[PDB]
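Human: I would love a firmer grasp of how sequence relates to backbone shape in proteins. Take your time, and here it is.
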Amino acid sequence: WKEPCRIELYRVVESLAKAQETSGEEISKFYLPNCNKNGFYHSRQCETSMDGEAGLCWCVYPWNGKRIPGSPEIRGDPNC
């Protein structure tokens, strides 16, 4: 795909919506792909949070959204 992140984002949103229907817990954080406007991945990827706590962030290759080996994972901007 020319816009891999955008396609993934749609798929993830649909699956999350579906999972929430039968979810046995109330999730306050989840991972939505962080896409740039070209439909690739921002270097920094973070969990989405709605609970007043920082989500985990890590660093990816923008062309595929896969974590860079050795990347830090912290609740804050890793400065990717």
